[PDB]
Write a protein that binds this DNA or RNA. Sequence first.
RNA 1: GCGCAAGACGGACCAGAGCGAAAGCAUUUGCCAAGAAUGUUUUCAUUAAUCAAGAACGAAAGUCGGAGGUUCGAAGACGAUCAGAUACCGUCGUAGUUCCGACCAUAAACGAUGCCGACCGGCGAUGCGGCGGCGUUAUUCCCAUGACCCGCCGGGCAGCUUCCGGGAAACCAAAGUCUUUGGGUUCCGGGGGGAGUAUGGUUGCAAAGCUGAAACUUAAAGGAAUUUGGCGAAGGGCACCACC
RNA 2: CCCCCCCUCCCGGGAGAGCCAUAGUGGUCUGCGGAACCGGUGAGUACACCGGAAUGAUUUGGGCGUGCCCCCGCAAGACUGCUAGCCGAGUAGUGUUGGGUCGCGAAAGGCCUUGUGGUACUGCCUGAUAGGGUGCUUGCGAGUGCCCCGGG
Lengths: 129, 57, 83, 217, 149
Amino acid sequence: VRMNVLADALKSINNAEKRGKRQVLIRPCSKVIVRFLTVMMKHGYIGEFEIIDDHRAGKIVVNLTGRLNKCGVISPRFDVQLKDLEKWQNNLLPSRQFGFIVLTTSAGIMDHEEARRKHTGGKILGFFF
Amino acid sequence: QTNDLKEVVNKLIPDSIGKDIEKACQSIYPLHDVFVRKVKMLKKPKFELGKLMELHG
Amino acid sequence: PLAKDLLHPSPEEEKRKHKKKRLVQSPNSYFMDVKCPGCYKITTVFSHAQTVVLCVGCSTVLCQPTGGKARLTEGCSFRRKQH
Amino acid sequence: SGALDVLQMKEEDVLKFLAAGTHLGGTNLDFQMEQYIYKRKSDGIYIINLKRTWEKLLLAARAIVAIENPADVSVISSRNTGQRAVLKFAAATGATPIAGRFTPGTFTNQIQTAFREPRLLVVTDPRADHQPLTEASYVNLPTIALCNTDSPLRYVDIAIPCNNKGAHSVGLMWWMLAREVLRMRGTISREHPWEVMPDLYFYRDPEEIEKEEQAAA
Amino acid sequence: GRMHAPGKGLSQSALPYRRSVPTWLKLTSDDVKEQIYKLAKKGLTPSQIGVILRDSHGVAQVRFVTGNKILRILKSKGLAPDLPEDLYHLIKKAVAVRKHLERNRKDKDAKFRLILIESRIHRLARYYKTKRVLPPNWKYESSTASALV
RNA sequence: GCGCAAGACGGACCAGAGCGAAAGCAUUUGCCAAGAAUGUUUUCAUUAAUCAAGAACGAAAGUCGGAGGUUCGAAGACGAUCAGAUACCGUCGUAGUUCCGACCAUAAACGAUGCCGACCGGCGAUGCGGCGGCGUUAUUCCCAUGACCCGCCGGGCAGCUUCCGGGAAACCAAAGUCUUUGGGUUCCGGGGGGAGUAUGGUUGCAAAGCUGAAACUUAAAGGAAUUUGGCGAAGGGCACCACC
RNA sequence: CCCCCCCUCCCGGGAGAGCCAUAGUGGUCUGCGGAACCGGUGAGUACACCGGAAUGAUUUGGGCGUGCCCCCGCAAGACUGCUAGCCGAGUAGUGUUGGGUCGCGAAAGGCCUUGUGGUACUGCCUGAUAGGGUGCUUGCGAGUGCCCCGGG
């Protein structure tokens, strides 16, 4: 059954990105999906999206732009420390000039550079470049 | 059940039973080729000459 | 089509799709008021009634249950309620 | 493309549409042709919207007049419906015509005598002329096609929705395409009717040719 | 899809977005409580009560016009049945299947369906044990199924 | 040609149609129990998915005990064929083929393709349920039901096309979303033989089923596709070194 | 004296449920104002007694499906059914698959204006010149022709 909503959302986003569509319909939303999409907005990979509020579980319509290569989700949520982040940087990113790792820290959902800036670590969520 | 052999053979010379079946079954599913294909005879009573000469004149 | 705006579609596309596949789920059923030609009691009958509802007085049968929408008897005119 | 007030479809053009049978199309509908269809009716005939046809015709005319070498537009028709129409179009606007038997190797084989290397391509049918469409893929060369309601859209760039089956409609499209290109170029004034006769672009069976020769002088 | 069937279904109710009482409805929540009590005194399940109210009395849900559901109201008044209705229906179906197998021993498919029904019964009874609706010493067996209705 | 008796089976209708978890299921009628999908503004509220141990079903053949044995027919008896023919072919023919009661759990049990869930092109049909709309018919009026016609929705057996994408290719709308490698979960394979063999355990009345090696030996064994060649393979033509 | 049919051609007359107009009528739908809005009474379809209430005095047709259903007066329109003098009469009979307010459908006899023009057709059966079957022609495929009667 449906067990990882975020993996399904990024899989649909990546599939419609490879297809070439301009709008993506994610059927189940979550707070984690909202924070992930906010990070992808603030780093300039996706456009301006919506939350379709119904009374069961909201839908999300994402305005796409042609700047996205791949969106992936690491399952399960492996706990990573600050000394173990560089291992993920070399075996997950395509380059050091770009690419970001979204990880769940206690200060909030954020990328790896802000995680190094606030001097904290957490659990893995995914990646985008 | 309301006829004996004479007028039911007279009814069997045309397909009047077939036309009645085709007319009655039109509301269920329309048929077009309905023919009485076989009539057998299981039991026969005692031989009476009078019905034979009434069946020949 | 390469570009389809799913934020607001045409209303006939919303009518055309399944009741769970819309942008916001809306049932295809409705409530309505019926009245007998002889007896004068306005009652509320569901569209997919799935049961035998009766008038207040037990004189005439309003509807028969079917697979989908209920079958109203002849002479019992109806109109849809809304607000 | 039709956004101005001088670029509106006038009174006589609608009459030519209704008399040439342009507004009605085929039976099947291609899923790329959902937007160029008004509605469907009885006996399985789709109605082509004439205003969107006008917009696409103005867009194709703009694309034709945008380049400054008239010999660099190549126009191909291999079906008998548009043999003389593309010849009159090439005589009017200065394009280069191909009328029947498009040899596979003009645009790609560089040592052939018929090695053609144009900049813009106009074809009269996307389905029957599948050979110039795939040959136009190996070079950076756009393609404008006169497309029906059931013609497949692949390797096309400006799709003009029309009835490409009758000879009257095809000749009418080629005549108004030449007219609009010459009006944008400045050879033809925009308000005086330069209309000679539209039947110079019309294809007919030869039985009608001896019929007209017998009935005429 | 289903639990003991290879098919997949998409036939279920779809509530509207508006959760407000319509203006044409003229039933105060005490009146529909009285009607629910009357239908429960007539001996009906809460599902059938909701069906009858929705078909005849014009209400959409009790929960949209009253702060409790039908079973919650029946438990507050104190006349709800001591056994859940779906588990009771499953026990009744299993009793009917076992009664069919008392005289027909060649029906292997009905034995397979009896195994499926008993598996569903045990699966629902485990959840009702963990939710503390059933006593912990409750157990579905054959001879226990005959005394219970 | 007219009748009697015995047993087996359900042609044509019968389809790239239906149902069932699979094996499988085709004369009519009656009884009993069960099930998928559709419809729902009904009810409970997370009760879910996959699965060591364990458990039900399971083609044909095979075993034990009865009733019955029409046709077909292992073993067998002959007659031809042939150098030989305890083979192909023909005539008989025992177990078996049929039903009941009790056993084994084996198939190329194959979609040679585990189950649940999501996403990514188009088209025409088909079986079910529901919805809408011009018209024809159950003889002329109305309504509902059957039968046609034009469409929509959901589930299912499938089909055509495709520079989506994948692959060694055959091909696949899944065998795709895979170095841009992580949705969840069960079983299973590490070159070819020895070998599903030895031994031990276990099940069975038996035949046999499950678990299951090692010594030794070997540089290949295999999969897809192209070219030639030869077919007691097919389709067209030719030759007195071929024939009539 | 080729004595029997039979097919076709030129023209005309009759029966039948074709179409376009014409006379008699009958229905469905349409807009305008119910002196202005909130409730109580006896079943409430048009109903009647009132209380609030608008301008000292006077007073505005209803129902509960809160928006179209009744009853009014006005104004003419779009569509359709029947008859081919009218009344008898939609009356018997007939009909079904399930109903209805029900299709098909007569004559006796009586009051006048004694009964409106053009255009076609018809294999046989069934239940209309419709519908659904199914033939004749030369073996095929496609055409013409196959009601009754009269002159050649």
